[PDB]
Amino acid sequence: NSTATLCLGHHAVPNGTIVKTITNDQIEVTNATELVQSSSTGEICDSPHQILDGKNCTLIDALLGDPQCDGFQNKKWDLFVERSKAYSNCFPYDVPDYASLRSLVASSGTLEFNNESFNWTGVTQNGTSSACIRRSKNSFFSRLNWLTHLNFKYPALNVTMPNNEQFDKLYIWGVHHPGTDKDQIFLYAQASGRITVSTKRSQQTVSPNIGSRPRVRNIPSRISIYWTIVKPGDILLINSTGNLIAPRGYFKIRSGKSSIMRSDAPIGKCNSECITPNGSIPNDKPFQNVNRITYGACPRYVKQNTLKLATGMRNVPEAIAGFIENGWEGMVDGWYGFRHQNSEGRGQAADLKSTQAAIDQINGKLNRLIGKTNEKFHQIEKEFSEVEGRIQDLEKYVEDTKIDLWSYNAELLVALENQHTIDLTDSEMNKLFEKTKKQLRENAEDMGNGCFKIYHKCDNACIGSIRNGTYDHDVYRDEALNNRFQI
Amino acid sequence: NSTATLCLGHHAVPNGTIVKTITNDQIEVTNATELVQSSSTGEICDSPHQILDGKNCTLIDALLGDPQCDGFQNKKWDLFVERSKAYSNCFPYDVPDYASLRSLVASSGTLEFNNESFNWTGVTQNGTSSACIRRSKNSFFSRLNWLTHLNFKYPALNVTMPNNEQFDKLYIWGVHHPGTDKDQIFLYAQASGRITVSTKRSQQTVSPNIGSRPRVRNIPSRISIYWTIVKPGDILLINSTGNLIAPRGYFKIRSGKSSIMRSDAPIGKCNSECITPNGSIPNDKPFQNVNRITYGACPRYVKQNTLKLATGMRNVPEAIAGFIENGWEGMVDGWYGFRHQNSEGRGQAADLKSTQAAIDQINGKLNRLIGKTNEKFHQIEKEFSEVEGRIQDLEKYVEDTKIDLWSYNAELLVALENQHTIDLTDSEMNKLFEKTKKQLRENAEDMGNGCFKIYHKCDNACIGSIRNGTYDHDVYRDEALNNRFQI
Amino acid sequence: NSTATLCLGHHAVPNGTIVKTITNDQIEVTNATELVQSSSTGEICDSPHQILDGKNCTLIDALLGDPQCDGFQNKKWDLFVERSKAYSNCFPYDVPDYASLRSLVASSGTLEFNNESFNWTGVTQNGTSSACIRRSKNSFFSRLNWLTHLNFKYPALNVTMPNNEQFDKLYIWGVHHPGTDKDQIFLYAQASGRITVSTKRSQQTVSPNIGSRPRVRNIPSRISIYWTIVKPGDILLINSTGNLIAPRGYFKIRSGKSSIMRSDAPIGKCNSECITPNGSIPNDKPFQNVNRITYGACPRYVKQNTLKLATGMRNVPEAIAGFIENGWEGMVDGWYGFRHQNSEGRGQAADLKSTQAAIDQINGKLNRLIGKTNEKFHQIEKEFSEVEGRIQDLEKYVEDTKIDLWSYNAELLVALENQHTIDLTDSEMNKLFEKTKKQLRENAEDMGNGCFKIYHKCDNACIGSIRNGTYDHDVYRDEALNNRFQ
Ligand SMILES: *[C@@H]1O[C@H](CO)[C@@H](O[C@@H]2O[C@H](CO)[C@@H](O)[C@H](O)[C@H]2NC(C)=O)[C@H](O)[C@H]1NC(C)=O
Ligand SMILES: *[C@@H]1O[C@H](CO)[C@@H](O[C@@H]2O[C@H](CO)[C@@H](O)[C@H](O)[C@H]2NC(C)=O)[C@H](O)[C@H]1NC(C)=O
Ligand SMILES: *[C@@H]1O[C@H](CO)[C@@H](O[C@@H]2O[C@H](CO)[C@@H](O)[C@H](O)[C@H]2NC(C)=O)[C@H](O)[C@H]1NC(C)=O
Numbered sequence A, B: 001n002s003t004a005t006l007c008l009g010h011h012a013v014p015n016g017t018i019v020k021t022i023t024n025d026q027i028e029v030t031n032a033t034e035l036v037q038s039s040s041t042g043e044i045c046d047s048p049h050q051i052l053d054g055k056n057c058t059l060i061d062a063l064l065g066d067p068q069c070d071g072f073q074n075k076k077w078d079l080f081v082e083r084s085k086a087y088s089n090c091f092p093y094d095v096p097d098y099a100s101l102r103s104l105v106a107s108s109g110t111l112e113f114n115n116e117s118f119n120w121t122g123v124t125q126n127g128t129s130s131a132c133i134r135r136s137k138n139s140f141f142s143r144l145n146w147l148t149h150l151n152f153k154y155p156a157l158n159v160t161m162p163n164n165e166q167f168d169k170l171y172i173w174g175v176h177h178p179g180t181d182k183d184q185i186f187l188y189a190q191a192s193g194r195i196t197v198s199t200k201r202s203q204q205t206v207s208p209n210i211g212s213r214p215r216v217r218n219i220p221s222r223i224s225i226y227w228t229i230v231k232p233g234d235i236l237l238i239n240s241t242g243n244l245i246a247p248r249g250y251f252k253i254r255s256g257k258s259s260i261m262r263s264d265a266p267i268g269k270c271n272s273e274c275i276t277p278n279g280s281i282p283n284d285k286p287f288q289n290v291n292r293i294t295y296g297a298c299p300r301y302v303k304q305n306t307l308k309l310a311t312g313m314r315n316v317p318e319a320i321a322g323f324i325e326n327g328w329e330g331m332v333d334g335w336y337g338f339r340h341q342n343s344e345g346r347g348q349a350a351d352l353k354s355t356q357a358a359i360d361q362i363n364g365k366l367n368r369l370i371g372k373t374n375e376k377f378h379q380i381e382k383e384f385s386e387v388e389g390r391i392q393d394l395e396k397y398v399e400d401t402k403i404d405l406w407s408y409n410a411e412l413l414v415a416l417e418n419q420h421t422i423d424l425t426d427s428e429m430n431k432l433f434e435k436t437k438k439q440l441r442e443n444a445e446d447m448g449n450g451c452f453k454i455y456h457k458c459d460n461a462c463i464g465s466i467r468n469g470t471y472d473h474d475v476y477r478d479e480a481l482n483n484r485f486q487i
Numbered sequence C: 001n002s003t004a005t006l007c008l009g010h011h012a013v014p015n016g017t018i019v020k021t022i023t024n025d026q027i028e029v030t031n032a033t034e035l036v037q038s039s040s041t042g043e044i045c046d047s048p049h050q051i052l053d054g055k056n057c058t059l060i061d062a063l064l065g066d067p068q069c070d071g072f073q074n075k076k077w078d079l080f081v082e083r084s085k086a087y088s089n090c091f092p093y094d095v096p097d098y099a100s101l102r103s104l105v106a107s108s109g110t111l112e113f114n115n116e117s118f119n120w121t122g123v124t125q126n127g128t129s130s131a132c133i134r135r136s137k138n139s140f141f142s143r144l145n146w147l148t149h150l151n152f153k154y155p156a157l158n159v160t161m162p163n164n165e166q167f168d169k170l171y172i173w174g175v176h177h178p179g180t181d182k183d184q185i186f187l188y189a190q191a192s193g194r195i196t197v198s199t200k201r202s203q204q205t206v207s208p209n210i211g212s213r214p215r216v217r218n219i220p221s222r223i224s225i226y227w228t229i230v231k232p233g234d235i236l237l238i239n240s241t242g243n244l245i246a247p248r249g250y251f252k253i254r255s256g257k258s259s260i261m262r263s264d265a266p267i268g269k270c271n272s273e274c275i276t277p278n279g280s281i282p283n284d285k286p287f288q289n290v291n292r293i294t295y296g297a298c299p300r301y302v303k304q305n306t307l308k309l310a311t312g313m314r315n316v317p318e319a320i321a322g323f324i325e326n327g328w329e330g331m332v333d334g335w336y337g338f339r340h341q342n343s344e345g346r347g348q349a350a351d352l353k354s355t356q357a358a359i360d361q362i363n364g365k366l367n368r369l370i371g372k373t374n375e376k377f378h379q380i381e382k383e384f385s386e387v388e389g390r391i392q393d394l395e396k397y398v399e400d401t402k403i404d405l406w407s408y409n410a411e412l413l414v415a416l417e418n419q420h421t422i423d424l425t426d427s428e429m430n431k432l433f434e435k436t437k438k439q440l441r442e443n444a445e446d447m448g449n450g451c452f453k454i455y456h457k458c459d460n461a462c463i464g465s466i467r468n469g470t471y472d473h474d475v476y477r478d479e480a481l482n483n484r485f486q
């Protein structure tokens, strides 16, 4: 006829994704990305972090020198992996404040040990027992020196070890608790007395407690493990009359990124910045639901199993009509575009500048959210195997508080980001419509269905001029006004 | 007249509510709902949680078997309620790590106790004291066995109790600290030694400390309470030469939805998921300002006394003018609507579809905020009666940090939700205006007061057609253009 | 001519500021303000808080009565400032739980001490040491009483001190751990022994551990410090056979806005509510990056080095054209305005009401961020000089969690406020444009460049009438319609 229809609209897909917003909880979008990492590879990767596989050893067993842990002497790690199927196979022992010594060594990151010559005179060195078998022979912990009487005497030891280095020295020592008085005399030839280990800054006094304990590996006695840190310029003084499991030297304390994790996952040859007890995970997504226990440049742990961030506009499946009534399922070149009815025929073209503007805004939002990780190393324990009381309750409370707060932040962030993304794509659709209306001026009317009725003869070249912003409204003003406002 | 005026507007109320938004701290709205529960009912509900009223007893007194607490033997609970007017009325005692044992038992949720045939030979069982009167005669704690000499002899005990069950056993035992050497000899016939209670996994050694304490209920001596947890497959060994307040058996350790609260509120016949020290509270609102100490599906504690969530549009009290100049007080059928002046007279009708769309979006937000309360049980202590130091300070810091962060989240959430509520109601008013404008095409002009001037004669049926969305602009186009563009 | 052009637009500046929004990481705005305090004055301000400079003393040395701390006796403070240069010069000692006693006293906020007469009979009072020189004479801690034998006997002490007051009494006492057995006999005339200090509610039993330790200031022995809190109506009972460093009275326990801070900053004559280890800082900004350790009405600590809050509109550098194509670099009277071309030359005038509306919304926003501060006093230790284990790990975890969450809140808040600010200035520009369009009705067309083409001769009086909202579209309707549609 003497008019034409130019409809503006946007693409749609047959199978969209349901996302949450502020306005609604179940709104369909054309595309979305998952922001919660919900699965692991099942293996701990050797790179980029140095992984020390504990095998059958615990970190403390490796520290003390348990005969099965000889392969752990002087090792370094970024993450120590402690296996569930691990056990002591040496003299029964315990550690008051076990969690603290384990934390100290895991944080330090090394078992580097330097032997020192202690003046252990008047006593017999290198005591052994059938509990600790090293090479089919009776042994003891490789980093401890079990001192016993010499010729039925155990003279009081007053042994000085100055710290003349520029680093802190970690000394591991213990106290033997015999299972009977007969053992106390056999090994030390005198009453228990007490052991005092002191520095200029601190002191520790431990008394032996002789008596039977349930046998562990047929041993009715125990060794208690104690430690001390000697600062540069300080002096370690050990005063003992018996029952001393002496240090053979010191371990270095380092500051660093090292930690310990409990995991039965195998260790494999892959590169992954994040490590969890379930194995390494990708750290692209901002959130994870694999484990609360993490090491490295990991995503933050949330309770939500899935959070999907819209990466497209509202999906609205389906004469010509535009964005007000529905989306266009026949558009594959871009997100926004034009469809028209002319004298020559019907056609369609995408508006690639508006499409890219919407994509760049989405890309910017994804860039702020994706690839930004939070690198954490030594942290509190999050899983417990014993009922300890007030301190464990506080550690659980702190972790649950952190998880609830980050889950809230993730839920609010995703709902705000999805509401904003929809608003951005609606704004781009509306800007394209307003641009077209302003370009057409008085030569077209808004039909209320996202289309313009053009009141002058319009060919495909004219539509092309409109689409790329080169339409001259004055050339057609007289025809359009005569048709629009009948005279 | 040859023309008519069709005005669009929205309701207003004589008494609005002041809410906060991001843009303005004090915006008046037609309606708002409180999101902070600031008052309790004053009573603790018997349902749905099992409530154990401690009456005159603390949890530890019920655990030990204080005579006034005999009514709590073998009881179970979901929440143990500890009264301020509670006191011990038995032998004076203390508990190292009292908070840990109280938490441990409260978390377990039961006083179920199984007696065991301990081989307490060579000693006299069931010692009593005048401090503990049961049935008007001298007694002792019902779950403790005060062992004394037999015929002026107290042979060393080496008593083994294997754990052959599939569950952990909690053994409660103590150490008697006589107030004089005469009591130590009178009761045990020998000087004090040490008590060692050990397992394959752990050991505890406690020495008696003879000496006077300020008398409590006329007793100068004290009992210290210790506990041990025996895992399946382990063995309990009690090694003692005197001063042992022996277990009579064990308590079962459970893990579940159980805790302890200090409260003086009465307990009554009601059903409420959330229990606070001030009594049960409703759990419909997302936040509460009653107490930081809660149990069950409770709203999160915030510092704000009030937070009002807008549930309506901004209140703008009042020929005809629309939403740009004011709201309409005289409209009760809906939130959005029309007023007109035509050839027949004045009139008004509400637009019910826009009203419902706004309401549905508000109800969506309300459903997101209301009734989504998260359920928490055993947590940490938040109120303290004694000055303890570093651990109490950390617990207070953790709770204050949590409260400040949730108060921030509540303030930001309400300001964002109220700003969004205003934006949605303004968007619905604007959408109704744009819809009307598009329906009218060139037959009407925007007068800048929220009204359209229609340039053709209108009857009530025509205005109704416009409200319905059935208005045909072509049958009126020639009249409206001849009048609208008259020179 | 027969037509006129009336353009609407907004100002621009030669050089704006880059801020973050939700939509983009770097948007240029005409003005922005810093919300993170990144520097201190270098001095601790004298008021409003009561500041006690520890000089060469620690809080514990001041508590015990170290000779260098006599000037701190019976003092009160809101903030105790502990210097990194502080050192002890008295008998060597330790505290089994040093952090708890230091926190306890710092929280109490006072060294007020009330002497009590204890029945220390049969023993020698006021023992001294060459380690603690007060006036060129051997002395001891001024709040401790080193008891020794009398005539080579130390009878067992059973000393009762009832609490008949209405407040909690803090008793500081200790145990001497001699360096050998000769010291134990020389001082107490008997080996070993045990000290029990008890109340109705609790008891503490400490054994001396005789033996050498590394010499500190030439003293091979140590004193361990213990404390007891006695509630009103309770009794302090001290039972000792030797090695007792007795109390001389009690310290009052209070509850209030008091704490302790470690800092080497000097104390000035400044008045500032917020104190950090680096010195006091302004507390006007909602956030700070000076230190995680704060006292008083301080901004919250964030990791961000800077956060800029837009305080103006987007900066769009600059026939005539309006806001769709460019801003106006030549408009310095307001933020929004009109520029016109008619037969009588060209001109410009600012729209003062839209400018003020945008400013009022921004000032409202600033009042929600600036000044409002959360005041905190005693907290937790955030920096450590020793490797302690599980408790230190938890304290660090809690503080890092708090910082990460507040840094998140600060980034989200600033991005939301900047995106909203941009939306506010775009909305005000669009509202002024729509207002003009509604006033002009059919007498003008929107040219798509932020300007209106008016189809009737619009003189400076017509354009002034339009700018102030007094334009009558009917007066010019016949001319404008004849020029526009014919
Ligand atoms: C205390 O009792 C325990 C257990 O009843 C004794 O330990 C047992 O000793 C025998 C050998 O005498 C072993 O065959 C058992 O396997 C041991 N069992 C356990 C659980 O240790 C212990 O010897 C007793 N102590 C004294 C001093 O008599
Ligand atoms: C140590 O002193 C306390 C308190 O001075 C003595 O306890 C008092 O003993 C008398 C009876 O001898 C009672 O009437 C008082 O009520 C007790 N008071 C308190 C606070 O317990 C205690 O007996 C003394 N001990 C020794 C061994 O002399
Ligand atoms: C135990 O050893 C320490 C250190 O080897 C002895 O302390 C030293 O004593 C001499 C005096 O005899 C002083 O000059 C040194 O400065 C001391 N050194 C330290 C580090 O304190 C201590 O005397 C010895 N104890 C016994 C009982 O022999």
Ligand SMILES: *[C@@H]1O[C@H](CO)[C@@H](O)[C@H](O)[C@H]1NC(C)=O
Pocket: A013, A015, A030, A031, A032, A311
């Ligand atoms: C979603 O976007 C990704 C690119 O990020 C693309 O590979 C994928 O095919 C898209 N899916 C849909 C349904 O549009």
Ligand SMILES: *[C@@H]1O[C@H](CO)[C@@H](O)[C@H](O)[C@H]1NC(C)=O
Pocket: A055, A056
């Ligand atoms: C662990 O111990 C078992 C025996 O209990 C042995 O068969 C296995 O090979 C050990 N593993 C390693 C890595 O040494």
Ligand SMILES: *[C@@H]1O[C@H](CO)[C@@H](O)[C@H](O)[C@H]1NC(C)=O
Pocket: A125, A126
């Ligand atoms: C003790 O054993 C170590 C090796 O662990 C050896 O170097 C040292 O000489 C031995 N000492 C004695 C006294 O046998």
Ligand SMILES: *[C@@H]1O[C@H](CO)[C@@H](O)[C@H](O)[C@H]1NC(C)=O
Pocket: A156, A157, A158, A193, A194, A195, A196, A239, A240, A241, C210, C211, C212
């Ligand atoms: C401390 O060392 C001295 C000197 O050898 C000794 O006589 C004393 O018994 C030692 N004490 C302890 C507890 O080892």
Ligand SMILES: *[C@@H]1O[C@H](CO)[C@@H](O)[C@H](O)[C@H]1NC(C)=O
Pocket: A038, A039, A040, A277, A278, A289, A290, A291
């Ligand atoms: C990771 O391991 C924990 C502990 O076994 C388990 O609860 C969790 O479901 C696991 N997650 C995945 C993704 O395997």
Ligand SMILES: *[C@@H]1O[C@H](CO)[C@@H](O)[C@H](O)[C@H]1NC(C)=O
Pocket: A460, A461, A464, A465, A468, A470
């Ligand atoms: C716009 O499109 C028309 C027809 O497709 C073409 O002739 C014209 O050169 C184009 N202009 C620009 C700037 O791309």
Ligand SMILES: *[C@@H]1O[C@H](CO)[C@@H](O)[C@H](O)[C@H]1NC(C)=O
Pocket: B013, B015, B030, B031, B032, B311
């Ligand atoms: C606000 O809404 C509630 C229902 O949600 C209603 O009961 C109340 O009367 C309303 N108040 C006003 C002023 O509209």
Ligand SMILES: *[C@@H]1O[C@H](CO)[C@@H](O)[C@H](O)[C@H]1NC(C)=O
Pocket: B038, B039, B040, B277, B278, B289, B290, B291
């Ligand atoms: C609840 O009790 C606490 C005291 O434990 C009190 O401070 C608070 O104001 C009370 N709240 C209400 C709503 O009664």
Ligand SMILES: *[C@@H]1O[C@H](CO)[C@@H](O)[C@H](O)[C@H]1NC(C)=O
Pocket: B055, B056, B068
């Ligand atoms: C609790 O103790 C009071 C006396 O203080 C007594 O009157 C009351 O009956 C007791 N209640 C129970 C349940 O034993």
Ligand SMILES: *[C@@H]1O[C@H](CO)[C@@H](O)[C@H](O)[C@H]1NC(C)=O
Pocket: B125, B126
């Ligand atoms: C001790 O008292 C309990 C109470 O149940 C009783 O069963 C037991 O037989 C008594 N034993 C002796 C030796 O009195």
Ligand SMILES: *[C@@H]1O[C@H](CO)[C@@H](O)[C@H](O)[C@H]1NC(C)=O
Pocket: A210, A211, A212, B156, B157, B158, B193, B194, B195, B196, B239, B240, B241
């Ligand atoms: C443990 O029992 C044995 C049994 O002979 C005894 O000799 C030993 O002294 C006891 N120890 C304690 C601490 O009771």
Ligand SMILES: *[C@@H]1O[C@H](CO)[C@@H](O)[C@H](O)[C@H]1NC(C)=O
Pocket: B464, B465, B467, B468, B470
């Ligand atoms: C139009 O609106 C009027 C209002 O009263 C109503 O009665 C009539 O049924 C409506 N018609 C349609 C087709 O919606």
Ligand SMILES: *[C@@H]1O[C@H](CO)[C@@H](O)[C@H](O)[C@H]1NC(C)=O
Pocket: C013, C030, C031, C032, C311, C312
């Ligand atoms: C920014 O605002 C401040 C007042 O807060 C004003 O003094 C300054 O001149 C403004 N700068 C610009 C470029 O507008």
Ligand SMILES: *[C@@H]1O[C@H](CO)[C@@H](O)[C@H](O)[C@H]1NC(C)=O
Pocket: C055, C056
């Ligand atoms: C601190 O001690 C030094 C001596 O080491 C002294 O010179 C200085 O004046 C002291 N400072 C104060 C404030 O007393």
Ligand SMILES: *[C@@H]1O[C@H](CO)[C@@H](O)[C@H](O)[C@H]1NC(C)=O
Pocket: C125, C126
């Ligand atoms: C101990 O010293 C104090 C210091 O104030 C003094 O008042 C008291 O009389 C002295 N007592 C003896 C016995 O020297």
Ligand SMILES: *[C@@H]1O[C@H](CO)[C@@H](O)[C@H](O)[C@H]1NC(C)=O
Pocket: B210, B211, B212, C156, C157, C158, C194, C195, C196, C239, C240, C241
């Ligand atoms: C407690 O005081 C009495 C007083 O007669 C004394 O005999 C006993 O040894 C004291 N005990 C301690 C631990 O001081």
